[PDB]
Amino acid sequence: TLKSFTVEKGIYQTSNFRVQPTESIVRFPNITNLCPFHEVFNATTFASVYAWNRKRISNCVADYSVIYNFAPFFAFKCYGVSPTKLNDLCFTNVYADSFVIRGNEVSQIAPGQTGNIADYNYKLPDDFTGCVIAWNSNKLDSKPSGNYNYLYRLLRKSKLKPFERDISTEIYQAGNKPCNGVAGPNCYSPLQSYGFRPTYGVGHQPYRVVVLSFELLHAPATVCGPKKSTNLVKNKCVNFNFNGLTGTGVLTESNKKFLPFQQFGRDIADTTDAVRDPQTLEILDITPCSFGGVSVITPGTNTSNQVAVLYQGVNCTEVPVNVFQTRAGCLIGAEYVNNSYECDIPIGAGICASYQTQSQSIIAYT
Amino acid sequence: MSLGAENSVAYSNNSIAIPTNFTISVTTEILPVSMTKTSVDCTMYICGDSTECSNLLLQYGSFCTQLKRALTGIAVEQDKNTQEVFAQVKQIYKTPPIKYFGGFNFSQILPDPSKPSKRSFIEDLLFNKVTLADAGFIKQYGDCLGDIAARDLICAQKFNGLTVLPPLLTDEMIAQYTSALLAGTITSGWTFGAGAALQIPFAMQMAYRFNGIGVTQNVLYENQKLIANQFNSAIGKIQDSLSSTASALGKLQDVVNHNAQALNTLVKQLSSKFGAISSVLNDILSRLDKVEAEVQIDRLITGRLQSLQTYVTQQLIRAAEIRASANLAATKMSECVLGQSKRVDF
Amino acid sequence: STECSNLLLQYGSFCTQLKRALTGIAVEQDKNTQEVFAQVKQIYKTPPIK
Amino acid sequence: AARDLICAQKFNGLTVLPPLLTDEMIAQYTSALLAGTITSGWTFGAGAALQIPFAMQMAYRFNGIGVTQNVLYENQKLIANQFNSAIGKIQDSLSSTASALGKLQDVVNHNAQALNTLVKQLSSKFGAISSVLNDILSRLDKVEAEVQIDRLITGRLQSLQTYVTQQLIRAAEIRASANLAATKMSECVLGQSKRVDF
Amino acid sequence: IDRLITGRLQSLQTYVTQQLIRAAEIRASANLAATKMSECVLGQSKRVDF
Amino acid sequence: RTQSYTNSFTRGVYYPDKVFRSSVLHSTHDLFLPFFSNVTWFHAIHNPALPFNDGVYFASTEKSNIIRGWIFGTTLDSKTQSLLIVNNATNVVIKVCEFQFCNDPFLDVYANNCTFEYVSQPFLMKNLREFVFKNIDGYFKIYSKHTPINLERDLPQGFSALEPLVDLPIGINITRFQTLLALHAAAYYVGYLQPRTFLLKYNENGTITDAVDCALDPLSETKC
Ligand SMILES: *[C@@H]1O[C@H](CO)[C@@H](O)[C@H](O)[C@H]1NC(C)=O
Ligand SMILES: *[C@@H]1O[C@H](CO)[C@@H](O)[C@H](O)[C@H]1NC(C)=O
Ligand SMILES: *[C@@H]1O[C@H](CO)[C@@H](O)[C@H](O)[C@H]1NC(C)=O
Ligand SMILES: *[C@@H]1O[C@H](CO)[C@@H](O)[C@H](O)[C@H]1NC(C)=O
Ligand SMILES: *[C@@H]1O[C@H](CO)[C@@H](O)[C@H](O)[C@H]1NC(C)=O
Ligand SMILES: *[C@@H]1O[C@H](CO)[C@@H](O)[C@H](O)[C@H]1NC(C)=O
Ligand SMILES: *[C@@H]1O[C@H](CO)[C@@H](O)[C@H](O)[C@H]1NC(C)=O
Ligand SMILES: *[C@@H]1O[C@H](CO)[C@@H](O)[C@H](O)[C@H]1NC(C)=O
């Protein structure tokens, strides 16, 4: 700490001691069903852009390594999460949205975009988390005559809110004269076909898009990845894993009156203080393991090599991981005497340390 | 606003005004001397029980070493301030068991052996008036481990690497120094501050004090009972005003409130995101791959380092102000108590 | 600017303590002036004879 | 004419607060102290104001410095003439030389220069593509403009905290000077000081 | 280079702030030394422990 | 129908998140009903459909199953998907599609593109029932509270924090709003939410006992 090969006389704050964790704890809900990711990635025809199909996924074990074996994609673009970490972490709800768009507007499926699909057909929220999967579908969704089974909205009278779907087909009005159900002058049908052909360029090919949106909330967890749950041990400094988030601390029984809809407790500094076990309905407190400061009391190297260690702010008659108790911590390696001299090396509340012949040792005194 | 009462003193070139009586006035001056000693652990505050964040924090150089050096210098300076204010006497003097000092009553400022902390009545009132912030100078990990009632601010400060160090001199030693100064001043006068303590009766000492201010010493020897009664009434008025009014000690309370508020703001700054996706470190570790979490952790590291640097700078400025006040208090201890001052309004 | 304010809310309480420091300085200036000048108890006047 | 510096400071959130005591109240305090020290002497600072003729007060002041009081009563006209000539010389020196009041002008110049630097720091890019915030908002989508706005916010916050830190240090220096001025008011005006070069 | 520039600006500003605080302390000590030159050497002092 | 006006009287505060907090003063920004606002008193003895202006708030001083069900959506009788809730003594049916409706939507005691269907527990078990409806980012949320009263004249003076019920992902456009009545003298209060900033107070038991606005009066801005 001093970056020197010799030390003077005094007290020095060197390092900090910390009780290391011993065991590991994984706590996940007891679910055995497998998620229907196989039923969403293959279909004869996907839904259109304006009528995109949302699938509700819950109460199953989700393996994301089988997504790669179900479709030949490249753009596995995730926004609030990494693709490699989707099995370790846990959440509460999955929604899968399926539609077929053109190749030039794949970049419009992103948060905070402006265009044709994003403004009028399918909008993603600004704080969106999840993954967007898109792959080419030239073999299945292209015909030489021209596809008329896929539609997109041309224009609307207002913008679209995120995750809003409309089905209605009304003739657009762009003037004072009403349409009255006739698509004549200033009257256009909003549904326009894509018209996919195999002779088109690479930017006009059909693309099958599957968008996974993950609910990262404080609801109880229903759907997430496979991790084996171990036994729960209390009053030990362990590493815990409660529904995805990890930490190091000691778990005790809690007298906090959690409401039935609540899951987590928080402190002033937005750290987790109380947690609910996912398997049994109980509340556990999270408090860190033992820590503190370490001070070293020494004379000079030209005098002696003996040191005394002060563990600041702990009660080492109880937890210690010549012993004297002080108001400034506790003292190891210095023998207390019932005398009174001038203060040589200060320690704390009226206690000083010196190095005298009463055979040489470090003494402590008032 | 009103500046004061309107007056017009009657000046004439052959007229003078001379007092025919006097009053004895006892006034109270309060000066801060020291403040709260703090120590901050960087690895526990910025990252906390994490290895990747510690390895990214070691790449920033020696910001935390000089922050720790500044805090250690402040902590040594506070004990130096207390030592230069109070530890001025070479020997611990004791008052005699007889309590007759010419009719002057010193019972409310001299200590009593009825309690283990030998403090006077006025010292007890001053200690009861200032509501402390319950700092961590006494170890409190046993109370922080046992989850009772609700989590306090002291445990939240302690769990994030902020620790309050106890002062070198306890309150009993400050009270003993004050009692030694009082005994020397009452018995010897100003002679104990310039060498050995030469005893003198209190009436003759107060007659010397009247010769200091330009009054003939026969005035005390003719009005000793009146002067003793005026001093006793002034001391009783001081005791009444300290038992009744609670706003006189606002400087020490302001010191305690500032030292609590800085640590509370330092704890509250840990819930900020600083442009990252989350303020929680473990969620960033468990939700992202290596490079993106490195970016988010570096944003959090820069924000927490800036907040800690701001705290250390404000502590240094407050320590400079407290050192100036302690130098003034030591000068007033040397010049008002150990002697008689001819300086006006000092 | 609303977007700048929403991104400035994420930085915590830096501006609160900046405003606290500036308010303390502004109070201290008037305290300095009152400590220097406001020493006399009563507003005395000189006689009209000079 | 043109845009002033004060309007540019006011339009960007920087405001100067007026002092609590006006110049008339400070002049009233000065006049009260002058009338008290002219009529009473040092008696008005130790309690009630007791009048005394000014010649007898000057005899008291001469007896304070170790000169016998008959010297004043024998050279009163010469002492009054010397005092009047010295006061006239101070009048002429303040009317002629402008270099005496440099400390107060230094205070005014520092307080103006810090705010001018704080205003001028708003035109820096701080690594972004523009220093104008609306151009960043208009020229980019949400994520990239969020990055540039974060850069601008970090730079402006650093400049603001630098200004606050130097203002705190200058406030400490000004408070030390004000404590010295209060001591000099208590010891030179309300009494007679035996301290050398005070 | 922007990361290096930000780090070196922060280190230089920390050095300048510490130098300013130390200059304030040295100025206070120099004022005390000037007062002790004026009152102890150029005259005789009646102040106790001065 | 009869329209009257009543002071809101600092009522209609809900929990902003599913996170336990104890002995803390928390500040949040969410769609809240402002304090001492102007809610509308409606008497059902008689009916155009009410607006849904960024969220609504209910109170109802009656009991049993005389009041039940709500209708959400922009239009009626197809042409737009519409959110529909039916409550009874056994079940709750939440369903979002077109349906067939008359000019007076009511449930008697004695469709084309239809997607979302939902079933859960009944909402119900000197009787006030509070309700807060919100529609943010294609999600629809219900908050509710069950509190008694001493005198049945107006809204009480006190704090009753509303707890969430369900977090439905409806994802339609909701601009107009119609309520449902049961036919074989119903009173309800309507108040509209606004983007206000609050300062909530939590006790040692974790429940909200006090709150303040931040733009009601300058004292509340000082407390902010
Ligand atoms: C696609 O999924 C279906 C189940 O919906 C399955 O029957 C079919 O074999 C899958 N396609 C391939 C090529 O395996
Ligand atoms: C999961 O464990 C809890 C705890 O006893 C139990 O009540 C519940 O029935 C279990 N669930 C399953 C599906 O086994
Ligand atoms: C903590 O230290 C105090 C000081 O001596 C002691 O009285 C108390 O028993 C200790 N607590 C334990 C050992 O749990
Ligand atoms: C003294 O005062 C009186 C009036 O108070 C005045 O008439 C007289 O001239 C004064 N003495 C001198 C020498 O001016
Ligand atoms: C001094 O004062 C105390 C309380 O004011 C009183 O009890 C005591 O008797 C007094 N001393 C004498 C000698 O009267
Ligand atoms: C609500 O608004 C109506 C509009 O006329 C008014 O009559 C009524 O007094 C208002 N309620 C209040 C202010 O409580
Ligand atoms: C959809 O809602 C928005 C506001 O919520 C409104 O402006 C718009 O007119 C609505 N759309 C239709 C077709 O009414
Ligand atoms: C918190 O709950 C306990 C348990 O009944 C109760 O005794 C106490 O009064 C409650 N505190 C409140 C309501 O402030």
User: CB distance F20–A167 less than 8 Å?
Assistant: no
To the nearest 10°, report the CA torsion of B179, B184, B189, B195: -140
Greatest Cα pair distance in chain F: 58
The Cα A261–Cα F164 span in angstroms is: 8
Distance from CA of A314 to the nearest CA of B (A): 6
Secondary structure, 3-state, chain B: CCCCEECCCCCCCCCCCCCCCCCCCCCCCCCCCCCCEEEECHHHHHHCCCCHHHHHHHHHCCHHHHHHHHHHHHHHHHHHHHHHHHCCCCCCCCCCCCCCCCCCCCCCCCCCCCCCCCCCHHHHHHHHHCCCCCCCCCCCHHHHHCCCCCCCHHHHHHCCCEEEECCCCCHHHHHHHHHHHHHHHHHCCCHHHCCCCCCCCHHHHHHHHHHHCCCCCHHHHHCHHHHHHHHHHHHHHHHHHHHHCCCCCHHHHHHHHHHHHHHHHHHHHHHCCCCCCCCCHHHHHHHCCHHHHHHHHHHHHHHHHHHHHHHHHHHHHHHHHHHHHHHHHHHHHHHHHCCCCCCCCC
User: CB distance F206–A266 less than 8 Å?
Assistant: no
**Which residues 99-118 of B have a C-beta within 8 angstroms of A?**
none
Contacts of B314 in chain C (CB under 8 A): 17, 21
The Cα B290–Cα A82 span in angstroms is: 10
Q: Which chains lie within 8 Å of chain A at 3 or more CB pairs, if any?
A: B, D, F
Contacts of F18 in chain A (CB under 8 A): 217-219, 261-264
The Cα A170–Cα A163 span in angstroms is: 21
Distance from CA of D64 to the nearest CA of C (A): 24
- According to DSSP, residue A105 is labeled G
The Cα A11–Cα A309 span in angstroms is: 9
The Cα B76–Cα B323 span in angstroms is: 12
- The separation between CA A239 and the C-alpha centre of its own chain, rounded to angstroms, equals 17
User: Cβ(F130)–Cβ(F14) under 8 Å?
Assistant: no
Of F160, F157, F167, residue with least CA distance to F146: F160
The Cα A141–Cα A139 span in angstroms is: 6
The Cα F191–Cα F176 span in angstroms is: 14
Assigned token pair, B341: 């001052």
Of A311, A304, A302, A298, residue with least CA distance to A354: A298
**Helical packing angle, B290-332 and B250-268, nearest 10°:** 170
Gap between the terminal Cα atoms of chain D = 51
* A113: nearest CA partner in chain D: D141
Contacts of D191 in chain B (CB under 8 A): 343-345
The Cα A257–Cα B127 span in angstroms is: 39
Of A320, A342, A340, A344, residue with least CA distance to A332: A320
- The separation between CA D6 and the C-alpha centre of its own chain, rounded to angstroms, equals 21
Distance from CA of A159 to the nearest CA of F (A): 11
- Give, in degrees to the nearest 5, the angle at Cα A215 between A212 and A217: 165
The Cα F187–Cα F59 span in angstroms is: 9
The Cα D198–Cα B287 span in angstroms is: 70
Ligand 7 geometric centre to CA of F103 (Å): 22
- According to DSSP, residue A103 is labeled G
Of A328, E50, F181, C17, residue with least CA distance to D198: E50
Contacts of D142 in chain A (CB under 8 A): 111-112, 126
With a 6 Å cutoff on the Cβ, whether B271 touches ligand 4 is no
Contacts of B136 in chain A (CB under 8 A): 313
Which of B2, B8, B251, B315 is the best residue to mutate to test the C interface, defined by the most C CB atoms within 10 Å of its own CB? B8
Nearest atom, ligand 6, residue F36 CA: 14
Which of E11, E12, E39, E49 is the best residue to mutate to test the B interface, defined by the most B CB atoms within 10 Å of its own CB? E49
With a 6 Å cutoff on the Cβ, whether F203 touches ligand 8 is yes
Ligand 4 geometric centre to CA of B20 (Å): 27
With a 6 Å cutoff on the Cβ, whether B7 touches ligand 4 is no
Ligand 7 geometric centre to CA of F173 (Å): 6
Ligand 4 geometric centre to CA of D133 (Å): 77
- Tally the residues of chain E: 50
User: β-strand A335-336 against A361-365: which pairing, if any?
Assistant: parallel
Gap between the terminal Cα atoms of chain A = 29
The Cα A69–Cα A57 span in angstroms is: 20
Assigned token pair, A99: 């539609």
Contacts of A258 in chain F (CB under 8 A): 20, 206
Strand partners, A272: A266
Of F63, F3, F56, residue with least CA distance to F178: F56
With a 6 Å cutoff on the Cβ, whether F91 touches ligand 8 is no
Mutating to test ligand 8, I would choose from A257, A258, A259 the residue with most ligand atoms within 8 A of its C-beta, which is: A257
Count Cβ–Cβ pairs < 8 Å, chain A vs chain B.
Answer: 109
**What is the Cβ-side half-sphere exposure of residue D131, based on CA atoms within 13 angstroms?**
10
Of B302, B72, B276, residue with least CA distance to B165: B72
- The Cβ of residue B49 has, within 10 Å, a number of other Cβ atoms equal to 20
Residue F120: C-alpha distances to residues A261, F111, F131, F170 (Å): 16, 21, 17, 15
Residue that the structure tokens 């002696």 belong to: A304
User: β-strand F194-202 against F50-51: which pairing, if any?
Assistant: unpaired
Residue E9 one-letter amino acid: L
**Experimental technique used to determine this entry:** cryo-EM
Q: Which long-range contacts (CB under 8 A, 24 or more apart) does B3-7 make?
A: B3/C38, B3/C43, B3/D25, B3/D28, B3/D29, B3/D32, B4/C40, B4/C41, B4/C42, B4/C43, B4/D32, B5/C41, B5/C42, B5/C43, B6/C42, B6/C43, B6/C45, B7/C42, B7/C43, B7/C44, B7/C45, B7/D49
Assigned token pair, F105: 């939507």
Nearest residue (by CA) to ligand 3, atom 2, is A315
What DSSP string describes D153-174?
Answer: HHHHHHHHHHHHHHHHHHHHHH
Residue D66: C-alpha distances to residues D58, D60, D190, E37, E42 (Å): 13, 10, 20, 23, 17
H-helix segments, chain F:
218-223
Strand partners, A362: A355
Residue that the structure tokens 């930490």 belong to: A247
